[PDB]
Design an enzyme around this catalytic site. Sequence first.
Site, PDB file in Angstrom:
ATOM      1  N   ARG A 151      -1.697  -0.994 -19.877  1.00  0.00           N
ATOM      2  CA  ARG A 151      -1.413  -2.425 -19.820  1.00  0.00           C
ATOM      3  C   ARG A 151      -0.251  -2.790 -20.734  1.00  0.00           C
ATOM      4  O   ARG A 151       0.703  -3.457 -20.311  1.00  0.00           O
ATOM      5  CB  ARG A 151      -2.662  -3.226 -20.191  1.00  0.00           C
ATOM      6  CG  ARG A 151      -3.809  -3.104 -19.203  1.00  0.00           C
ATOM      7  CD  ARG A 151      -3.536  -3.894 -17.937  1.00  0.00           C
ATOM      8  NE  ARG A 151      -4.703  -3.954 -17.066  1.00  0.00           N
ATOM      9  CZ  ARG A 151      -4.962  -3.087 -16.097  1.00  0.00           C
ATOM     10  NH1 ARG A 151      -4.159  -2.063 -15.854  1.00  0.00           N
ATOM     11  NH2 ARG A 151      -6.050  -3.252 -15.352  1.00  0.00           N
ATOM     12  N   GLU A 357      -7.247   7.694  11.624  1.00  0.00           N
ATOM     13  CA  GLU A 357      -5.849   7.787  12.032  1.00  0.00           C
ATOM     14  C   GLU A 357      -5.718   7.873  13.548  1.00  0.00           C
ATOM     15  O   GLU A 357      -4.784   7.307  14.128  1.00  0.00           O
ATOM     16  CB  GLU A 357      -5.181   8.985  11.362  1.00  0.00           C
ATOM     17  CG  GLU A 357      -5.149   8.902   9.844  1.00  0.00           C
ATOM     18  CD  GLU A 357      -4.376   7.700   9.338  1.00  0.00           C
ATOM     19  OE1 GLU A 357      -3.395   7.299   9.996  1.00  0.00           O
ATOM     20  OE2 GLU A 357      -4.752   7.154   8.280  1.00  0.00           O
ATOM     21  N   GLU A 384      -6.119  -2.964  10.891  1.00  0.00           N
ATOM     22  CA  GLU A 384      -6.968  -2.281   9.921  1.00  0.00           C
ATOM     23  C   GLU A 384      -8.427  -2.266  10.365  1.00  0.00           C
ATOM     24  O   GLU A 384      -9.118  -1.254  10.202  1.00  0.00           O
ATOM     25  CB  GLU A 384      -6.832  -2.947   8.555  1.00  0.00           C
ATOM     26  CG  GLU A 384      -5.408  -3.048   8.039  1.00  0.00           C
ATOM     27  CD  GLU A 384      -4.940  -1.774   7.367  1.00  0.00           C
ATOM     28  OE1 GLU A 384      -5.782  -0.886   7.120  1.00  0.00           O
ATOM     29  OE2 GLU A 384      -3.730  -1.663   7.080  1.00  0.00           O
ATOM     30  N   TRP A 459      -5.657 -16.410 -15.809  1.00  0.00           N
ATOM     31  CA  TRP A 459      -6.038 -15.180 -15.122  1.00  0.00           C
ATOM     32  C   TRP A 459      -7.386 -14.673 -15.615  1.00  0.00           C
ATOM     33  O   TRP A 459      -8.288 -14.396 -14.815  1.00  0.00           O
ATOM     34  CB  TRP A 459      -4.951 -14.123 -15.321  1.00  0.00           C
ATOM     35  CG  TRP A 459      -5.385 -12.717 -15.034  1.00  0.00           C
ATOM     36  CD1 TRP A 459      -5.872 -11.811 -15.930  1.00  0.00           C
ATOM     37  CD2 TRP A 459      -5.349 -12.049 -13.767  1.00  0.00           C
ATOM     38  NE1 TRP A 459      -6.151 -10.624 -15.299  1.00  0.00           N
ATOM     39  CE2 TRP A 459      -5.838 -10.744 -13.970  1.00  0.00           C
ATOM     40  CE3 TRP A 459      -4.955 -12.428 -12.482  1.00  0.00           C
ATOM     41  CZ2 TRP A 459      -5.944  -9.818 -12.936  1.00  0.00           C
ATOM     42  CZ3 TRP A 459      -5.061 -11.508 -11.457  1.00  0.00           C
ATOM     43  CH2 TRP A 459      -5.552 -10.218 -11.690  1.00  0.00           C
ATOM     44  N   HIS A 487       0.638  -3.429  -5.430  1.00  0.00           N
ATOM     45  CA  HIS A 487       0.914  -4.452  -4.425  1.00  0.00           C
ATOM     46  C   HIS A 487       1.598  -5.667  -5.038  1.00  0.00           C
ATOM     47  O   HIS A 487       2.540  -6.218  -4.456  1.00  0.00           O
ATOM     48  CB  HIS A 487      -0.382  -4.862  -3.725  1.00  0.00           C
ATOM     49  CG  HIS A 487      -0.954  -3.798  -2.841  1.00  0.00           C
ATOM     50  ND1 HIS A 487      -1.554  -2.662  -3.339  1.00  0.00           N
ATOM     51  CD2 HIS A 487      -1.013  -3.696  -1.493  1.00  0.00           C
ATOM     52  CE1 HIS A 487      -1.961  -1.907  -2.334  1.00  0.00           C
ATOM     53  NE2 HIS A 487      -1.645  -2.512  -1.203  1.00  0.00           N
ATOM     54  N   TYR A 497      -6.871  -7.374   3.553  1.00  0.00           N
ATOM     55  CA  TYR A 497      -8.124  -6.658   3.326  1.00  0.00           C
ATOM     56  C   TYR A 497      -9.324  -7.591   3.450  1.00  0.00           C
ATOM     57  O   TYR A 497     -10.342  -7.234   4.061  1.00  0.00           O
ATOM     58  CB  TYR A 497      -8.091  -5.987   1.955  1.00  0.00           C
ATOM     59  CG  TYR A 497      -6.787  -5.274   1.680  1.00  0.00           C
ATOM     60  CD1 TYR A 497      -6.441  -4.126   2.377  1.00  0.00           C
ATOM     61  CD2 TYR A 497      -5.897  -5.756   0.731  1.00  0.00           C
ATOM     62  CE1 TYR A 497      -5.248  -3.474   2.133  1.00  0.00           C
ATOM     63  CE2 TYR A 497      -4.703  -5.111   0.482  1.00  0.00           C
ATOM     64  CZ  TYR A 497      -4.383  -3.971   1.184  1.00  0.00           C
ATOM     65  OH  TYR A 497      -3.194  -3.326   0.937  1.00  0.00           O
TER      66      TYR A 497
HETATM   67  C1  LIG Z   1       9.153  -8.581   9.955  1.00  0.00           C
HETATM   68  O1  LIG Z   1       9.565  -8.132   8.690  1.00  0.00           O
HETATM   69  C2  LIG Z   1       8.450  -7.699   7.897  1.00  0.00           C
HETATM   70  C3  LIG Z   1       9.003  -7.318   6.543  1.00  0.00           C
HETATM   71  O2  LIG Z   1      10.388  -7.008   6.618  1.00  0.00           O
HETATM   72  C4  LIG Z   1       7.684  -6.556   8.575  1.00  0.00           C
HETATM   73  O3  LIG Z   1       6.439  -6.446   7.893  1.00  0.00           O
HETATM   74  C5  LIG Z   1       6.065  -5.082   7.635  1.00  0.00           C
HETATM   75  O4  LIG Z   1       5.150  -4.600   8.619  1.00  0.00           O
HETATM   76  C6  LIG Z   1       4.734  -3.241   8.412  1.00  0.00           C
HETATM   77  C7  LIG Z   1       3.845  -2.878   9.578  1.00  0.00           C
HETATM   78  O5  LIG Z   1       3.403  -4.036  10.273  1.00  0.00           O
HETATM   79  C8  LIG Z   1       4.035  -3.103   7.062  1.00  0.00           C
HETATM   80  O6  LIG Z   1       3.742  -1.726   6.847  1.00  0.00           O
HETATM   81  C9  LIG Z   1       2.460  -1.563   6.205  1.00  0.00           C
HETATM   82  O7  LIG Z   1       2.649  -1.251   4.835  1.00  0.00           O
HETATM   83  C10 LIG Z   1       1.440  -1.042   4.103  1.00  0.00           C
HETATM   84  C11 LIG Z   1       1.807  -0.857   2.644  1.00  0.00           C
HETATM   85  O8  LIG Z   1       2.014   0.533   2.424  1.00  0.00           O
HETATM   86  C12 LIG Z   1       2.913   0.714   1.311  1.00  0.00           C
HETATM   87  O9  LIG Z   1       2.303   1.515   0.316  1.00  0.00           O
HETATM   88  C13 LIG Z   1       1.965   2.853   0.731  1.00  0.00           C
HETATM   89  C14 LIG Z   1       1.243   3.520  -0.424  1.00  0.00           C
HETATM   90  O10 LIG Z   1      -0.019   2.884  -0.584  1.00  0.00           O
HETATM   91  C15 LIG Z   1       3.251   3.582   1.133  1.00  0.00           C
HETATM   92  O11 LIG Z   1       2.933   4.895   1.564  1.00  0.00           O
HETATM   93  C16 LIG Z   1       3.943   2.812   2.265  1.00  0.00           C
HETATM   94  O12 LIG Z   1       5.140   3.481   2.651  1.00  0.00           O
HETATM   95  C17 LIG Z   1       4.210   1.365   1.856  1.00  0.00           C
HETATM   96  O13 LIG Z   1       5.218   1.433   0.848  1.00  0.00           O
HETATM   97  C18 LIG Z   1       0.744   0.190   4.682  1.00  0.00           C
HETATM   98  O14 LIG Z   1      -0.463   0.426   3.976  1.00  0.00           O
HETATM   99  C19 LIG Z   1       0.447  -0.015   6.172  1.00  0.00           C
HETATM  100  O15 LIG Z   1      -0.090   1.187   6.700  1.00  0.00           O
HETATM  101  C20 LIG Z   1      -1.301   0.904   7.427  1.00  0.00           C
HETATM  102  O16 LIG Z   1      -1.089   1.092   8.805  1.00  0.00           O
HETATM  103  C21 LIG Z   1      -0.671   2.421   9.172  1.00  0.00           C
HETATM  104  C22 LIG Z   1      -0.395   2.415  10.661  1.00  0.00           C
HETATM  105  O17 LIG Z   1       0.491   1.338  10.942  1.00  0.00           O
HETATM  106  C23 LIG Z   1      -1.767   3.418   8.771  1.00  0.00           C
HETATM  107  O18 LIG Z   1      -1.336   4.736   9.071  1.00  0.00           O
HETATM  108  C24 LIG Z   1      -2.063   3.294   7.266  1.00  0.00           C
HETATM  109  O19 LIG Z   1      -3.108   4.188   6.898  1.00  0.00           O
HETATM  110  C25 LIG Z   1      -2.393   1.851   6.887  1.00  0.00           C
HETATM  111  O20 LIG Z   1      -3.662   1.578   7.483  1.00  0.00           O
HETATM  112  C26 LIG Z   1       1.694  -0.448   6.952  1.00  0.00           C
HETATM  113  O21 LIG Z   1       2.505   0.706   7.094  1.00  0.00           O
HETATM  114  C27 LIG Z   1       4.932  -3.626   5.946  1.00  0.00           C
HETATM  115  O22 LIG Z   1       4.229  -3.640   4.709  1.00  0.00           O
HETATM  116  C28 LIG Z   1       5.405  -5.041   6.262  1.00  0.00           C
HETATM  117  N1  LIG Z   1       6.311  -5.520   5.230  1.00  0.00           N
HETATM  118  C29 LIG Z   1       5.937  -6.370   4.269  1.00  0.00           C
HETATM  119  C30 LIG Z   1       6.999  -6.759   3.286  1.00  0.00           C
HETATM  120  O23 LIG Z   1       4.792  -6.805   4.196  1.00  0.00           O
HETATM  121  C31 LIG Z   1       7.404  -6.826  10.052  1.00  0.00           C
HETATM  122  O24 LIG Z   1       7.022  -5.620  10.703  1.00  0.00           O
HETATM  123  C32 LIG Z   1       8.625  -7.410  10.753  1.00  0.00           C
HETATM  124  N2  LIG Z   1       8.296  -7.810  12.112  1.00  0.00           N
HETATM  125  C33 LIG Z   1       9.011  -7.439  13.180  1.00  0.00           C
HETATM  126  C34 LIG Z   1      10.202  -6.568  12.906  1.00  0.00           C
HETATM  127  O25 LIG Z   1       8.711  -7.790  14.317  1.00  0.00           O
END
Ligand SMILES: *[C@@H]1O[C@H](CO)[C@@H](O[C@@H]2O[C@H](CO)[C@@H](O[C@@H]3O[C@H](CO[C@H]4O[C@H](CO)[C@@H](O)[C@H](O)[C@@H]4O)[C@@H](O)[C@H](O[C@H]4O[C@H](CO)[C@@H](O)[C@H](O)[C@@H]4O)[C@@H]3O)[C@H](O)[C@H]2NC(C)=O)[C@H](O)[C@H]1NC(C)=O
Lengths: 596, 198
Positions: A151, A357, A384, A459, A487, A497
Amino acid sequence: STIEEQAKTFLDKFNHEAEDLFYQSSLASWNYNTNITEENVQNMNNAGDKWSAFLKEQSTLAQMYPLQEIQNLTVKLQLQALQQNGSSVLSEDKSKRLNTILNTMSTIYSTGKVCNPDNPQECLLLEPGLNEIMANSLDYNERLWAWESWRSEVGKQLRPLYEEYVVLKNEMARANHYEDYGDYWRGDYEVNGVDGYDYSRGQLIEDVEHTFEEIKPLYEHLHAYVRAKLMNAYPSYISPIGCLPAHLLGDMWGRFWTNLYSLTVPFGQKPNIDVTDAMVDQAWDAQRIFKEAEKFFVSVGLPNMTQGFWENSMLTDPGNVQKAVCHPTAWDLGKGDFRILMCTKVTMDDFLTAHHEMGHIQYDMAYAAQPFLLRNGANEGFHEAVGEIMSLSAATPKHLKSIGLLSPDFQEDNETEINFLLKQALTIVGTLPFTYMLEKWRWMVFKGEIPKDQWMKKWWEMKREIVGVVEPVPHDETYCDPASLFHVSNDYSFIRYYTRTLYQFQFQEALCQAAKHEGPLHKCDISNSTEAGQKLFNMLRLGKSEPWTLALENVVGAKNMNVRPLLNYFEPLFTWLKDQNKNSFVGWSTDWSPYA
Amino acid sequence: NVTNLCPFHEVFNATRFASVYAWNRTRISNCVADYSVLYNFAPFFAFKCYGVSPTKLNDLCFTNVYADSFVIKGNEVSQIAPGQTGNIADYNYKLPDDFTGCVIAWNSNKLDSKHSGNYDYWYRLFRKSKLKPFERDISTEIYQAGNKPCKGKGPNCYFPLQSYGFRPTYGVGHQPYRVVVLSFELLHAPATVCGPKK
Ligand SMILES: *[C@@H]1O[C@H](CO)[C@@H](O[C@@H]2O[C@H](CO)[C@@H](O[C@@H]3O[C@H](CO[C@H]4O[C@H](CO)[C@@H](O)[C@H](O)[C@@H]4O)[C@@H](O)[C@H](O[C@H]4O[C@H](CO)[C@@H](O)[C@H](O)[C@@H]4O)[C@@H]3O)[C@H](O)[C@H]2NC(C)=O)[C@H](O)[C@H]1NC(C)=O
Ligand SMILES: *[C@@H]1O[C@H](CO)[C@@H](O[C@@H]2O[C@H](CO)[C@@H](O[C@@H]3O[C@H](CO)[C@@H](O)[C@H](O)[C@@H]3O)[C@H](O)[C@H]2NC(C)=O)[C@H](O)[C@H]1NC(C)=O
Ligand SMILES: *[C@@H]1O[C@H](CO)[C@@H](O[C@@H]2O[C@H](CO)[C@@H](O)[C@H](O)[C@H]2NC(C)=O)[C@H](O)[C@H]1NC(C)=O
Ligand SMILES: *[C@@H]1O[C@H](CO)[C@@H](O)[C@H](O)[C@H]1NC(C)=O
Ligand SMILES: *[C@@H]1O[C@H](CO)[C@@H](O)[C@H](O)[C@H]1NC(C)=O
Ligand SMILES: *[C@@H]1O[C@H](CO)[C@@H](O)[C@H](O)[C@H]1NC(C)=O
Ligand SMILES: *[C@@H]1O[C@H](CO)[C@@H](O)[C@H](O)[C@H]1NC(C)=O
Ligand SMILES: *[C@@H]1O[C@H](CO)[C@@H](O)[C@H](O)[C@H]1NC(C)=O
């Protein structure tokens, strides 16, 4: 020609270019993630830059056709998505400042580390050592030291960056139309233009409040039971009517209570249903596990994987010099290409993860016919929940008995069901208050109700009032505890979630009701049923072409979120806990503190 | 009536196979048309015949034969049939509703795809109207999807053609396919193109 025809032509051209650009970018990203080097990083960066630039110019052109002359209700969604997800409003200097701040925060979080005070030359990173120490070690002093060190060495650095970050984000959000960034985040659930299905951005807060109010008593009973067990464990720190100190929750932050199962098992003598030994004996491997998951998905009517999935995806870690990231992810490169990347061992957890998956891959496969801008889940929570329901259905003893891993000489008494329900609860119910409190605090911070000099005070007050957890060491305004979370520091939303937790149980109860099943809900399987598969597919194929309320009504018959399925899932455990807690006091008082 | 053999092995088995919007056309006449030269290729994705039967084809005799060849995607092969709608059907290649012939298509992913992407195959996307049966339109003028007169590539003005991006890692339904169409007819003639017989 009218506006609609020109919009349709522009959409056709944009789709036919964006498909190829997105495929190239995704292929570059996968090639980097599998074969970590430097030129792969260069190629990935180039592809990302090309994609971002193309989206920017396409949004700039798309900002010409007005949105009030279109009544097709399907062109409007795509036009709004283009106009909102690629537009840049702030000046170049402010954009560069924001990007630099984000990169600095991400690098600080990733490269942060702590060293042993006894031996300054010895240092350990968070993920390898700190997580393990917070998870399995049982000693007050070392856990307290690790918590305080992390922290103090993270939040103190990240506080000014967050203070400068919130102002820029508020300006960016207020620029377009929104009041602040909280409204920008909450706008994902908005539904407009449909009679009888409208949803405002202000409805989400009230719905969350109502659901948490209906949830509270079960969580407080579980909290009382866990507090009593911890009192039996730690004899000189926990108070009978106090609150649990934050550094005794099984992990760095307290998001999950899974690591407390080995200490709070209702019946130690009765063994669990781990099937690792049987899998080892029967000479299984990753191929067998994935084939079993494929067979399970086939048995409900859904199609199975293509030849490209088996040809291109990797399921085991190459080891040697081929470095890779072993985090399980599901890829959707487009143009009919689907892959799964994970390093699979022989464990029941890997069985469940493979099922999860494969469920995600099936969800991605379902809607691969809508336009390019509509190939996504109905909202941020549906995907999810669809992933999680498969893991819920694939862990029942009946499914394992049918497969053959579990011997047919197994019996299910009271205690096995109680243990299974408690293990599920410790992971599912124990995370809702944390998520709710964190999202609420971020909402007030962005709205501006909380001033800059009361951040930590509010907080910790809300932590005590909601989660019932008291800090072990007082913190002044120099600390930034929320920034220590991945996050929060990497600009990601956190209510998905909370939504998925309810959505998965509503979907599971609807599916089990469609399969004509009798008995407790926690013992339910839909392997042979085909009506459930078709009913699920009817919603899976929609994509984003309809509001999420309509899909929810189609699946479960309810337009809004409900908490009754979640309570019905845990009813026997709730009765057992109510019978068990006839001696110890139920509830907590916030006046107590570990530091006198 | 001793003659030579027809060049069936040349219209098939070619390196370059021509884009759809500029489909080739070869006339077959004055030879013996043996139909055992084909079937030596990959299992066909489609062998639909309309005027005759595939088995009742060796002994029959025709007047003249036309062969048309082009390359399309996988999920577009279903649009090559009498009385079908869609982009390819009405903007690139239209068949008459009384067609008498056969349609042959087979996967060619191993010969028409590259790692960096193949951009040598095009297909027209925009047009003012439909296409008459057995018609061709090879031209390049800027489309006018607007009221203001068009001058060059810009807002509300588009380049009519577009290219594919064939890659070896694409899934089925997006990989290239080779399509050959034969159009027979039986009418007033000395029956030049006859099947192999003695
Ligand atoms: C409009 O623009 C926004 C932002 O520019 C886009 O929003 C993104 O959407 C995608 C998918 O919808 C989001 O991706 C998700 O990210 C989650 C966060 O993961 C982070 O952390 C892990 C480590 O814990 C890293 O490995 C990872 O690379 C990331 O850095 C993931 O947890 C999500 O994964 C989930 O789904 C997949 C399958 O899809 C599973 O395999 C996983 O197990 C998990 O359940 C997911 O990948 C992304 O976060 C969004 N961005 C933001 C900023 O929120 C929109 O997509 C876009 N819209 C359009 C273009 O139409
Ligand atoms: C809003 O605009 C969309 C986009 O044009 C309209 O969807 C379109 O609906 C028509 C039929 O109503 C679809 O035509 C179909 O074409 C296929 C061939 O691809 C043919 O086999 C079918 O029989 C049918 O004729 C068209 O494809 C479809 N558009 C897209 C992009 O798929 C929608 O109807 C409009 N709605 C309103 C209320 O205006
Ligand atoms: C779904 O149906 C299949 C087909 O019958 C079931 O597979 C059988 O399961 C029984 C269980 O005792 C075995 O004795 C049979 O040998 C299995 N048959 C085959 C061909 O493998 C499957 O068990 C059913 N699903 C569930 C959850 O029971
Ligand atoms: C990984 O990248 C290196 C560097 O270019 C390359 O030589 C190699 O072929 C790639 N693939 C594997 C499997 O190593
Ligand atoms: C599942 O895969 C098998 C090949 O092992 C195939 O025969 C079967 O048709 C597939 N399932 C469906 C529903 O097509
Ligand atoms: C276990 O369940 C059975 C089912 O009827 C019940 O009769 C029995 O009383 C239960 N035992 C306990 C300890 O709850
Ligand atoms: C026919 O195909 C074979 C296959 O490789 C090739 O070797 C031969 O040259 C082809 N015949 C031509 C092009 O005339
Ligand atoms: C089209 O057919 C003619 C027939 O003689 C042939 O010479 C020509 O090479 C063909 N076109 C292509 C691109 O192969």
